[PDB]
Amino acid sequence: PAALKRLAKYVIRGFYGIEHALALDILIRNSCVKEEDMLELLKFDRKQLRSVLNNLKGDKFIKCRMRYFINYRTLVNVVKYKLDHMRRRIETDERDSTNRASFKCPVCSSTFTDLEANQLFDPMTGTFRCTFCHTEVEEDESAMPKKDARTLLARFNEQIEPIYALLRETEDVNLAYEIL
Amino acid sequence: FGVLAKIVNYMKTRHQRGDTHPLTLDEILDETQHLDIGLKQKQWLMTEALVNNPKIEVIDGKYAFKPKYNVRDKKALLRLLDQHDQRGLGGILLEDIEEALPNSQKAVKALGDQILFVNRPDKKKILFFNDKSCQFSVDEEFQKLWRSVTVDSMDEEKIEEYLKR
Ligand SMILES: [Zn+2]
Numbered sequence: 001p002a003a004l005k006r007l008a009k010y011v012i013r014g015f016y017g018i019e020h021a022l023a024l025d026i027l028i029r030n031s032c033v034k035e036e037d038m039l040e041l042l043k044f045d046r047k048q049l050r051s052v053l054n055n056l057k058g059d060k061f062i063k064c065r066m067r068y069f070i071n072y073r074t075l076v077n078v079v080k081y082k083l084d085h086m087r088r089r090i091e092t093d094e095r096d097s098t099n100r101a102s103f104k105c106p107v108c109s110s111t112f113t114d115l116e117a118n119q120l121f122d123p124m125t126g127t128f129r130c131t132f133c134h135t136e137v138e139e140d141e142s143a144m145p146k147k148d149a150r151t152l153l154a155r156f157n158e159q160i161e162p163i164y165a166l167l168r169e170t171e172d173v174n175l176a177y178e179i180l
Numbered sequence: 181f182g183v184l185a186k187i188v189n190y191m192k193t194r195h196q197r198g199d200t201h202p203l204t205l206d207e208i209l210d211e212t213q214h215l216d217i218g219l220k221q222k223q224w225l226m227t228e229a230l231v232n233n234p235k236i237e238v239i240d241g242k243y244a245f246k247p248k249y250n251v252r253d254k255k256a257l258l259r260l261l262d263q264h265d266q267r268g269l270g271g272i273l274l275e276d277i278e279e280a281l282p283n284s285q286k287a288v289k290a291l292g293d294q295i296l297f298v299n300r301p302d303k304k305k306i307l308f309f310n311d312k313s314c315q316f317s318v319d320e321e322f323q324k325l326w327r328s329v330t331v332d333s334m335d336e337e338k339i340e341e342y343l344k345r
Contacts, residue, residue, distance in 0.1 A: 009230075009313060010316075012313075013311075013312070013313030013315060013316070014315060015325070018296050018309065021311070022309055042270070043270055043300055045300060045301055045302070059329065059330075062237075081330070081337060082330065083341055084337075084344075085330025085331075086329070088330070088340045088343070089327060089329065100248070125337055147343065156317060156318075160316065163316075
């Protein structure tokens with residue numbers, strides 16, 4: 001699983017810090033080392049390394065063997081589980097959160113939609129008057145992208161996708177590798 | 181007893197200064213002008229203590245590798261710092277400083293090669309390691325990563341699987 005080893009080397013760099021990356025890396029070689037031994041090998045602080053180990057174990061990066069001696073080893077799922085979850089994270093993002101229908105009152109900075117426009121009308125002025133502090137409303141752009149920026153992240157996501165294509169192929173090879 | 185401990189500290193200092201040359205107990209007594217420690221004590225120090233001390237290597241009639249298990253080389257252990265896939269496993273800030281010169285200049289140089297520093301043990305201790313792959317997207321570094329993961333909790337992953345199918 002040399003490909004998976006490298007795909008993992010990708011995952012450590014992208015994800016957490018180098019301490020975590022270092023701990024994951026030693027484990028990738030099918031480590032079953034004693035925690036005290038893993039402490040001496042790593043030379044971290046015992047409590048804090050354990051904090052690293054608990055942070056990694058809970059998100060589900062780690063598996064154990066109760067030997068009452070405690071032993072740690074990389075969970076046997078081969079990242080894909082992590083990647084699938086991450087893809088959903090990206091897949092959620094990708095979806096538009098900005099409404100194409102949007103007035104706001106400058107005074108109260110509240111937000112309103114097309115749905116409220118048929119009620120926020122006032123015929124004596126021929127335009128819109130707010131509910132609790134009647135003032136003219138114009139556009140919104142509140143807690144929302146004005147220009148480019150969510151889109152730049154979507155373009156960023158697009159930029160990510162080719163450099164992830166090879167990794168998707170790494171996955172393809174891994175997925176054929178599930179005969180072996 | 182005290183005299184020997186002073187010898188060891190001197191010996192570390194002399195190694196730091198650069199004098200890695202092999203020498204004898206008689207020579208150290210001389211150079212420190214403490215030959216009048218008495219032949220009984222001299223002998224006991226020589227043929228019991230400084231033979232049971234694992235920090236020195238006895239060669240023929242003289243002591244080598246001086247202060248401890250070391251390889252010295254001008255503290256320019258670049259290959260050692262490299263060390264292929266093993267990657268040192270991990271160097272210590274204290275050992276490099278003890279080695280010859282202060283670490284800081286070397287570390288600064290090492291920070292612009294492939295090395296990373298972590299504040300191990302007591303934030304005051306530092307370890308060096310070898311990184312490789314760059315980070316994959318310029319986000320604000322930490323807000324998107326916090327949002328991106330699979331729920332720590334069971335059946336979440338199964339809800340992601342079900343949404344895919
Ligand atoms: Zn208002």
